[PDB]
Write an enzyme that holds these catalytic residues in place. Structure first.
Site, mmCIF file in Angstrom:
data_model
loop_
_atom_site.group_PDB
_atom_site.id
_atom_site.type_symbol
_atom_site.label_atom_id
_atom_site.label_comp_id
_atom_site.label_asym_id
_atom_site.label_seq_id
_atom_site.Cartn_x
_atom_site.Cartn_y
_atom_site.Cartn_z
ATOM 1 N N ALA A 230 44.233 38.018 34.348
ATOM 2 C CA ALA A 230 44.915 39.087 35.069
ATOM 3 C C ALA A 230 45.443 40.153 34.118
ATOM 4 O O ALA A 230 45.315 41.353 34.387
ATOM 5 C CB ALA A 230 46.052 38.508 35.909
ATOM 6 N N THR B 271 39.942 32.117 43.497
ATOM 7 C CA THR B 271 39.798 33.567 43.488
ATOM 8 C C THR B 271 38.443 33.992 44.037
ATOM 9 O O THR B 271 37.413 33.441 43.660
ATOM 10 C CB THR B 271 39.973 34.144 42.065
ATOM 11 O OG1 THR B 271 39.424 35.466 42.011
ATOM 12 C CG2 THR B 271 39.279 33.265 41.039
#
Lengths: 245, 187, 203, 231, 238, 240, 240, 212, 228
Positions: free
Chosen positions: H49, H1
């Site tokens: 998330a 990420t």
């Protein structure tokens, strides 16, 4: 269910708390009790009235030991006094002795009793106590003391006083016989003489209750071994009262 | 985390590192003006420090508004110490160490206090939190004088900052005195 | 061990008609000296209390006992005696039986009515230790025991008691890494209290 | 009258006046009729509006796929009771995988109503209810009053001037009892019954509401054009 | 007699008294068309020193929902907070705009809370003393106007008037509303009826207007636009 | 239980609180208390309401080492409030390591009194307080607080049975440059002139002073013994 | 607990407790607020109490809620103190949470909300206070004044009076205050405030208090000498 | 990420990747790592998330309520304060969140606040968060300027994300671009990393160690 | 008014307590309790063909050693009986020895006093007579009333016709305390009741409770007839 969250004692337009005055009237309708302070002790006295001739009056005591050095008497409503004595003993243990290891002085215990009685005149859904209390005690740093506690929680220190039906006459008699030099025996004699006026029935050892705050009593202490360990409070038996009569 | 303080004859000088800890490009200020004459610098776990400092500042400003009066640095330090001592016993204690600088107007004197996360308060002529003390105390012990002026204190602080930079950037320097709180721009 | 984080030691001895209580002055974090002016001895009227252990707990207990003694004086209209203050300290400590203060309090005083010196020590949960000779507490407790069992005599004048307690404190502190950055001694009589700061090796 | 202050006070003859006042609140509501056969159950309701620019007040509330009701009186009380009934039916389905019986729901409403007439600080509900349903025992119609009384009937009517509809239902009982498999005929019988309580108005598509439940029919509400063929 | 006492006729005393209180408030008028809904209120200034821009009788509940109030307007703030919270929470829980009728029902359930709640306390000691006109638009029902009362009952209206002059204004509304009204005609009609019911001369400071459309959402007209509309009404009438 | 509720916390059609006014009327029948502040001290003097029984061991109380109070009204309610005030002073000392300013404590007590007037269904406290204190902000301070929850600061004030006459007497014969002895004389003269009794004897009085020195440090509070009261009465000129 | 419904509706649709609280406000002393071109002036009337009152320690009836916002009141003083404390706590909380000081309107709305909550909650009585809130929004130079009532209604106003003979002062303000050209300098606003106060307060210039609020947190309470100078100027210009 | 955001004369540039991993297996390459809080505010995603999505949607609700109450657009500092206070209320529970809140107001200008699940709240100019933050931050430091045009700033963000995705195994998939101005945020698209690598290699002449 | 709840009248009285005393005489039944220096005996005067006689009784067994007799309405009587049984069981659990009669009487009297002082509680219109043979005091009779007042007795009688029984008992004691004789004491009490009231009490007109050193029990109708 209990919706009485509001005070039952309120100020009248004239500025008088009616319920406390009515409790005082109930006290003034009660039997006589007296207290006399001597140089080496305190005497507390009361009349013992029997509801029925078949009742064992010995099972009911109007004078109660609060601490080994503090006792009390009342005029007014008996059950209120009984509950108040239980609460006073519990507060003496849980507020002073469990913190300092010693029994409280007379004045502080009187203040706690007065706080309990005051709370009944401002909390919600409660009737004020209909009693007046005379508390006699001794402590190391203040000597002997006598106090009077009213239904409103006001307390005052007295050299000698009386409460009940014959309050005014007994107060006048005690005023005429105060000299700041009495001893315990003189105070007991004066108390007996003052009670003889206010008692209409038979006046003997079975109709009088007397208690004294005097000297330490090693006999009323069921153990030996500690030099610093005395129960000054003492209740006179009926035989001793008869002998003094 | 560099938190350092030096109390000189008429003032208090505080120094706090302008560094954070990632990846970003800023000039963090780790001080809160508790009152016009009382400043607090903090260090410790991120998040807890800012929250605790803002809580203290809000309470002190509320007291100042309520009484229309300024608390002394001693009272402020005592209040902060009480808060930290309460925190250490709580479910989520604050991991914050503080330096409090002030200029008592009544006594007309500067004061410096050092408190840790446990609640240990000490008044000192000079103090530090973290590893600044281990590398600064030799110089502070050798050179400090209670009668130093503002310039001498600034020079000593500059030497201390250079010593810290030797064994590592920059510091923010605040001065508290009779005129209040100011920031040094020439440093 | 929280009790051995900040360091410090306190001693107390009884004289003829006098008492003495002494403490060290060091305050350190783990092994770095922070302050040499941290006194562990406080007084509430004529009763003296010395506390060793966590510095935060020392300050907190001092403030709490000042609170309680002020309220006691207001209600009783007289100062509290050492014998009653000992019971108060014991009850205050036992009220935290499971979250206890990590402290080493020692009480020294002279009873106003009797004139007899009184001395006592406590553990962290309020167990009372009454002694006629001496009480020790701190990180150098074993060194203090060794000094006191040898130097103490049953009856000493305050001038001799000062020397005895000072030598015991200094020689026990010089063998403890966490103790000693200065030293204070209190000599307490019926009508006078003297405080003396000793000279010490520092390190 | 000093005995009508609250719901915890009996009269010297033994009457609860707050309950009677709630019943009076019911008696001023719009007429609703309930009817049933061995296979279907039907509710017919006459709505009311504040004025011409206003819409008409809804009178039929669905409780579950097999159960519903119509109200007469204080509408928010009907909403409270309907929400309670929905919760109870949902609980029965979730916990036992079971469709709540109509009689048990009547018992639950009776118990909930009784508690509001015996303790201080709470008023009785101000609405009457007609409840229709279909369960494993067939079709059911119940009448609920805020005193807690619940009765099981073949047909009934509540609200203002409901006596004429009740008399009509009592006269033609054996007819509508046996209307099995023909929902439209039962609906028309109910409409004719509710026609007996009208005095100065006629049924229109704006003021008429119908509900039906049955053996193969989930609880369904018709209003507007959907009732145009029943007028 | 408590606050939950039934009269012998079958009504709650406090609700009726609150309706009487509502009857004393200033006048608010709502008119619903197919091009949006118009709300209008009169700003009843007590003194010439009162700055009329501080009087806010028309508020936004959401971009598609607005409201006007009459009566004890202090009591309306809690209900407005509740309605805004309900709309925002519905948007959070379902990623969609809330229907106007659902919001109105939530407001009425709140108004019921001087007694038993819609889902089974007594958060209030008395009913509200203010009535609400809730205007909105949704994809299911188009443009809607509702009247909500402290009794927990709400109605849908083509047009409604509340406040002190509600009876005469509503009588005018009965004879003047039709389903083919345009937005500008609705605005002019609201202004005309307000001028008829108000004791003072109508101007841009004594009254204000607002509109809800599907495109632009709820909006409150500025004083210049209202002044132009008043001038247009005066020219058209005379 | 709605019938038995007296509704102690409601307004009157004139915007008055009946219970507060009745408590004030109750206080107007209690022993007189007077506070006088001079340039270097404060004097509190209260008149008892008496017999020939124990007096040395009801109207004067100590809050901390620098603040004292004089009570007019019910004694037990006053004791409740005094215990609360003592706890508050100790809490302030614990938190800030400084002595609490007089005004903060007075305002806290006034807020406690006002709370009973606004919320709850309990009667108000029928007590009026005269506060005498010293702090580093303003020096010597004198305050009064009533059951209404209002507190005021005074140079000289009286509360009790004869407030009107005492206040009229104190308006004259008071100067901003008086001393502690002059204040003592003025308080005794006012008590003697306003007393509804044959003589102003020592057994019906309570006296207290707050000043500097007298075998103490910055501020000393002295509560006069009956012998000291008798000596002061002889010195001033009452000789009763 | 005590939860009786003290504020309820009457058959005519009135809440009597709110009206009686308004009467209590009427009994209170008179407060006035005027808007200037770049300042707000708050004037208050001191009660003609005894002359032994100490001006240093008594509350000044004008409390700074924040360094940029002040509040005056009329009615019961202790209830006003409660509202002032709540306002100060809320101002600090808002400054903490949003990193910006409150606007005048936000604080006024919060205070009005507290008053309305007390009008609607059970077991309490409504506040017998009306308030004037004045100040400047942060970084804004627009004077802001607001009035709050016991019921909870608030509005802005360009000049407003509360308490006692507020009708006479309000009529004077309406006659003398011009919306098109409000007073330019601070001196003109102070003169208008003092002249409006003099219409009801004829007991002299000692019982008048004046506070001036200016942007960037410039709050100044004028001394008695300056108010006396203004009053003497007004008296001199009254006749010639 | 990899996520990044920086400020410049034209406003704010936000650039994110789109890969999510569950160990060695790539669960998804179409993850949206920019939360659209409201048409004026953007929030990046890193860590958990679900926490980021849930609490930034909640933050949008809170900003809407604030704008309803105060009749003004909320400040970026205030919204970041709300989020930081909320996450600090949960400290120790196990939340994972490192986000950048980006906005542009009239009073403040363009503003970026980094908010962490540890209570940290930092105002900044350039932020890069993720396992590939080193390469992207190196690119940004080498090429950042205040006077960058909008096209240059967008290209710089894309290039930084590409540099991070080339070397970091847990980074890649595609690049999502966003531009934040005073009037709101403008979406500048999704660019596949594989095609972008070859296009950049051809146009710049970089990545000479890779055979094409 | 002051006559509806438990607050003071202007004369210092409590009207609700007096009215509860009046309520104690709703049943026209008298009870008599005496001591025999080794036992305690209580006798009650139970007075419709549809009723089951065995279920009618005003004598309760509070514990193994303590018995109780109630004068007043049966619902309040059963309230007090349940409360006393619970209190005795709790005492035995907490303190490890059997609850004595006088302490139980004091506890019940304290509860009655609480009722007389709290507004929301009404007093119970009953009079409670506890009998036992205490291990420290021998035979024991104690009595409590709605006012919170309790006392011990050598003998006692309760009911509307209690003056005659009390006078007869006092005359017997003056002749001469206790009864110097459990069956003999039971017959003495039966004869005393017969002489005080009149007629001939059949086995169905009385119920007898006997408390011995380790027990308290109740005699059946057959046993009562055996006494006759």
């Amino acid at each position: 269910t209990d919706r009485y969250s509001f005070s039952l004692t309120t100020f009248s337009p004239s500025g008088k708390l009616g319920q406390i005055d009515y409790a005082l009237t109930a006290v003034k309708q009660g039997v006589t009790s007296l207290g006399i302070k001597a140089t080496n002790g305190v005497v507390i006295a009361t009349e013992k009235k029997s509801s029925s001739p078949l009742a064992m009056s010995e099972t009911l005591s109007k004078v109660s030991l609060l601490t080994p050095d503090i006792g009390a008497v009342y005029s007014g409503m008996g059950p209120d006094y009984r509950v108040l004595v239980d609460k006073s003993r519990k507060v003496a243990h849980t507020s002073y002795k469990r913190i300092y290891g010693e029994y409280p002085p007379t004045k502080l215990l009187v203040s706690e009793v007065a706080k309990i009685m005051q709370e009944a005149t401002q909390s919600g859904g409660v009737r004020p106590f209909g009693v007046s209390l005379l508390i006699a005690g001794h402590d190391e740093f203040n000597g002997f003391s006598l106090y009077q506690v009213d239904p409103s929680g006001s307390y005052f220190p007295w050299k000698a006083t009386a409460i009940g039906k014959g309050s005014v006459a007994a107060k006048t008699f005690l005023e005429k016989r105060w000299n700041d030099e009495l001893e315990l025996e003189d105070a007991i004699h004066i108390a007996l003489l003052t009670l003889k006026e206010s008692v209409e029935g038979e006046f003997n050892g079975d109709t009088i209750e007397l208690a004294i705050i005097g000297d330490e009593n090693p006999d009323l202490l069921g153990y030996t071994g500690i030099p610093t360990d005395g129960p000054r409070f003492r209740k006179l038996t009926s035989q001793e009262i008869n002998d003094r009569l | 985390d560099i938190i350092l303080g030096i109390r000189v004859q008429d003032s208090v000088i505080l120094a706090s590192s302008k560094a954070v800890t990632g990846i970003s490009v800023d000039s963090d200020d780790k001080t809160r003006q508790l009152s016009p004459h009382t400043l607090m610098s903090f260090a410790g776990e991120a998040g807890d420090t800012v929250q605790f400092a803002e809580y203290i500042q809000a309470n002190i400003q509320l007291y100042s508004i309520r009484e229309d009066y300024e608390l002394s640095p001693q009272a402020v330090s005592s209040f902060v110490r009480q808060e930290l001592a309460k925190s250490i016993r709580s479910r989520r204690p604050y991991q914050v160490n503080v330096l409090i600088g002030g200029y008592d107007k009544k006594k007309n004197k500067p004061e410096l206090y050092q408190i840790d996360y446990l609640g240990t308060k000490v008044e000192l002529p000079y103090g530090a939190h973290g590893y600044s003390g281990f590398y600064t105390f030799f110089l502070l012990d050798h050179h400090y004088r209670p009668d130093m002026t503002t310039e001498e204190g600034l020079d000593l602080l500059k030497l201390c900052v250079q010593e810290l930079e030797k064994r590592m950037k920059g510091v923010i320097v605040k001065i508290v005195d009779k005129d209040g709180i100011r920031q040094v721009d020439d440093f | 061990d929280p009790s051995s984080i900040n360091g410090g030691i306190v001693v107390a001895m009884t004289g003829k008609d006098c008492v003495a209580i002494a403490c060290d002055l060091r305050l350190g974090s783990q092994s770095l000296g922070v302050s040499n002016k941290f006194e562990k001895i406080f007084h509430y009227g004529h009763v003296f209390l010395g506390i060793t252990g966590l510095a935060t707990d020392v300050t907190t207990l001092n403030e709490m006992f000042r609170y309680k003694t002020n309220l006691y004086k207001l209600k009783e209209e007289r100062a509290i005696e050492p014998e009653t203050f000992t019971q108060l300290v014991s009850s205050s400590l036992y009220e935290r039986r499971f979250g206890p203060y990590f402290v080493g309090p020692v009480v020294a005083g002279i009873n106003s009515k009797s004139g007899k010196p009184f001395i006592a020590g406590f553990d962290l949960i309020g167990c009372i230790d009454e002694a006629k000779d001496f009480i020790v507490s701190g990180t150098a407790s074993d060194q203090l025991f060794g000094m006191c069992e040898s130097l103490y005599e049953p009856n000493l004048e305050p001038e001799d008691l000062f020397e005895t307690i000072s030598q015991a404190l200094l020689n026990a502190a010089d063998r403890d890494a966490l103790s000693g950055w200065g030293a204070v001694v209190y000599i307490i009589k019926k009508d006078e209290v003297v405080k003396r700061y000793l000279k010490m090796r520092q390190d | 009258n000093n005995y009508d202050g609250d719901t915890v006070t009996f009269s010297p003859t033994g009457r609860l006046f707050q309950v009677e006042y709630a019943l009076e609140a019911i008696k001023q509501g719009s007429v609703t009729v309930g009817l049933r056969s061995n296979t279907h159950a039907v509710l017919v309701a006459l709505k009311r509006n504040a004025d011409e620019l206003s819409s008409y007040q809804k009178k039929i509330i669905k409780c579950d796929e097999h159960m519903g009701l119509s109200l007469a009186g204080l509408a928010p009380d009907a909403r409270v009771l309907s929400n309670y009934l929905r919760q109870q039916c949902n609980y029965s389905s979730l916990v036992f995988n079971r469709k709540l019986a109509v009689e048990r729901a009547g018992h639950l409403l009776c118990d909930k109503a009784q508690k509001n007439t015996q303790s201080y600080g709470g008023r009785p509900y101000g609405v009457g209810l007609l409840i229709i349903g279909y369960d494993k025992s067939g079709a059911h119609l119940l009448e609920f009053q805020p005193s807690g009384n619940v009765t099981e009937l073949y047909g009934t009517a509540i609200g203002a001037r409901s006596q004429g509809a009740k008399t009509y239902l009592e006269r033609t009982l054996d007819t509508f009892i046996k209307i099995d498999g023909n929902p439209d005929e039962l609906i028309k019988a109910g409409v004719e019954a509710i026609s007996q309580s009208l005095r100065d108005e006629s049924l229109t598509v704006d003021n008429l509401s119908i509900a039906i439940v049955g053996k193969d029919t989930p609880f369904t509400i018709y209003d507007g054009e959907a009732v145009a063929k029943y007028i | 007699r408590g606050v939950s006492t039934f009269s012998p006729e079958g009504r709650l005393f406090q609700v009726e008294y609150s309706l009487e209180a509502i009857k004393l408030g200033s006048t608010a008028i709502g008119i619903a068309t197919k091009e949006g809904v118009v709300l209008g209120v009169e700003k009843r200034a007590t003194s010439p020193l009162l700055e009329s821009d501080s009087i806010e009788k028309i508020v936004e509940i959401d971009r598609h929902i607005g409201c006007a109030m009459s009566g004890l307007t202090a009591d309306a703030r809690s209900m407005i907070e509740h309605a805004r919270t309900a709309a925002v929470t519905h948007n959070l829980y379902y990623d969609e705009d809330i229907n106007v009728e659902s919001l109105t029902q939530s407001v009425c359930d709140l108004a019921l809370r001087f007694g038993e709640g819609a889902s089974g306390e007594r958060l209030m000691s008395r009913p509200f003393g203010v009535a609400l006109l809730i205007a909105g638009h949704d994809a299911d029902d188009g443009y809607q106007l509702f009247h909500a009362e402290p009794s927990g009952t709400f109605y849908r209206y083509n047009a409604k008037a509340i406040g002190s002059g509600s009876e005469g204004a509503q009588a005018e509304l009965l004879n003047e509303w039709h389903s083919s009204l345009t937005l500008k005609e609705a605005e002019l009609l609201v202004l005309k009826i307000l001028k008829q019911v108000m004791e003072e001369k109508l101007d841009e400071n004594n009254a204000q207007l607002s509109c809800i459309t599907k495109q632009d959402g709820f909006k409150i007209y500025d004083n210049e636009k209202t002044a132009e509309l008043i001038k247009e009404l005066k020219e058209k009438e005379a | 239980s709605r019938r038995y509720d007296s509704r102690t916390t409601i307004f009157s059609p004139e915007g008055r609180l009946y219970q507060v006014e009745y408590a004030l009327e109750s206080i107007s029948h209690a022993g007189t208390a007077i506070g006088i502040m001079a340039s270097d001290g404060i004097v509190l003097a209260a008149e008892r309401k008496s017999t020939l029984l124990e007096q040395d061991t009801e109207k004067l109380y100590k809050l901390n080492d620098k603040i004292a109070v004089a009570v007019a009204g019910l004694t037990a309610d006053a004791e409740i409030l005094i215990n609360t005030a003592r706890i508050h002073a100790q809490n302030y000392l614990k938190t800030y390591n400084e002595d609490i300013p007089v005004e903060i404590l007075v305002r806290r007590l006034s807020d406690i009194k006002q709370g009973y007037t606004q919320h709850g269904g309990l009667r108000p406290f029928g007590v009026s307080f005269i506060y005498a204190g010293y702090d580093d902000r303003y020096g010597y301070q004198l305050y009064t607080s009533n059951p209404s929850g209002n507190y005021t600061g005074w140079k000289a004030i009286s509360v009790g049975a004869n407030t009107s006459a005492a206040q009229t007497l104190l308006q004259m014969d008071y100067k901003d440059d008086m001393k502690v002895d002059d204040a003592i004389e003025l308080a005794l003269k006012t008590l003697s002139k306003t007393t509804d009794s044959s003589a102003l004897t020592y057994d019906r009085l309570e006296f207290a002073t707050i000043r500097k020195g007298a075998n103490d440090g910055e501020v000393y509070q002295k509560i006069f013994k009956p012998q000291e009261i008798k000596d002061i009465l002889v010195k001033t000129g009452i000789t009763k | 607990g005590y939860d009786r419904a003290l504020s309820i509706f009457s058959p005519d649709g009135h809440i009597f407790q709110v009206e009686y609280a308004l009467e209590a406000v009427k009994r209170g002393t008179c407060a006035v607020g005027v808007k200037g071109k770049n300042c707000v002036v708050l004037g208050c009337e001191r009660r003609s109490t005894l002359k032994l009152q100490d001006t240093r320690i008594t509350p000044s009836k004008v409390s700074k809620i924040d360094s940029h916002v002040v509040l005056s009141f009329s009615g019961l003083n202790a209830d006003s103190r409660i509202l002032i404390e709540k306002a100060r706590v809320e101002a600090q909380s808002h400054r903490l949470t949003l990193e910006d000081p409150v606007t005048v309107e936000y604080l006024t709305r919060y205070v009005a909300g507290v008053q309305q909550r007390y009008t609607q909650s059970g077991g309490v009585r409504p506040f017998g206070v009306s308030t004037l809130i004045a100040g400047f929004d942060p970084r804004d130079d627009e004077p802001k004044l607001y009035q709050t009532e016991p019921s909870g209604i608030y509005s802005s106003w360009s000049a407003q009076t509360i308490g006692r003979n507020s009708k006479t002062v309000r009529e004077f303000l309406e006659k003398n205050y011009d919306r098109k050209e409000p007073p330019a300098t601070v001196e003109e606003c102070v003169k208008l405030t003092v002249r409006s106060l003099l219409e009801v307060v004829q007991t002299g210039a000692k019982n008048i208090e004046i506070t001036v609020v200016k942007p960037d947190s410039d709050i100044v309470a004028l001394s008695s000498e300056e108010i006396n100078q203004y009053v003497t100027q007004i008296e001199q210009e009254k006749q010639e | 990420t990899t996520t990044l955001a920086f400020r410049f004369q034209g406003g704010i540039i936000v650039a994110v990747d789109s890969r999510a991993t569950a160990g060695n297996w790539v669960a998804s390459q179409t993850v949206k790592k920019v939360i659209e809080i409201n048409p004026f505010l953007l929030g990046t995603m890193a860590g958990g998330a679900a926490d980021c999505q849930f609490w930034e949607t909640w933050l949008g609700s809170q900003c809407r309520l604030h704008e309803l109450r105060e009749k003004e657009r909320i400040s970026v500092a205030a919204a970041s304060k709300i989020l930081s206070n909320l996450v600090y209320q949960y400290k120790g529970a196990g939340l994972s969140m490192g986000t950048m809140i980006c906005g542009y107001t009239r009073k403040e200008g363009p503003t970026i606040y980094y908010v962490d699940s540890d209570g940290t709240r930092l105002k900044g100019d350039i932020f890069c968060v993720g396992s590939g933050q080193t390469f992207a931050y190196g690119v940004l430091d080498s090429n950042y300027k205040w006077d960058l045009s909008v096209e240059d700033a967008l290209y710089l963000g894309k290039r930084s994300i590409l540099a991070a995705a080339h070397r970091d195994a847990y980074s890649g998939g595609s690049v999502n671009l966003y531009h934040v101005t005073e009037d709101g945020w403008i979406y500048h698209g999704n660019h596949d990393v594989g095609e972008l690598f070859w296009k950049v290699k051809e146009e710049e002449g970089s990545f000479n160690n890779v055979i094409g | 008014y002051d006559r509806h709840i438990t607050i003071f009248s202007p004369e210092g009285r409590l009207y609700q307590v007096e009215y509860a005393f009046k309520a104690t005489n709703q049943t026209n039944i008298n009870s008599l309790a005496v001591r025999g220096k080794d036992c305690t005996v209580v006798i009650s005067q139970k007075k419709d063909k549809l009723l089951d006689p065995t279920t009618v009784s005003y004598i309760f067994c509070i514990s193994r050693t303590i018995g109780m007799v109630v004068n007043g309405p049966i619902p309040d009587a059963r309230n007090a009986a349940l409360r006393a049984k619970a209190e005795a069981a709790e005492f035995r659990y907490k303190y490890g020895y059997d609850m004595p009669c006088d302490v139980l009487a004091k506890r019940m009297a304290n509860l009655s006093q609480i009722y007389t002082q709290r507004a929301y509680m009404r007093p119970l219109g009953v009079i409670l007579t506890f009998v036992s043979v205490d291990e420290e005091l021998g035979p024991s009779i104690y009595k409590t009333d709605p006012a919170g007042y309790y006392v011990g007795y050598k003998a006692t009688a309760t009911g509307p016709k209690q003056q005659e029984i009390t006078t007869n008992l006092e005359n017997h004691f003056k002749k001469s305390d206790h009864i110097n004789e459990w069956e003999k004491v039971v017959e003495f009490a039966i004869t005393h009741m017969i002489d005080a009231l009149g007629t001939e009490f059949s086995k169905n007109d009385l119920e007898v409770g006997v408390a011995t050193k380790d027990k308290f029990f109740t005699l059946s109708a057959e046993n009562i007839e055996e006494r006759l």
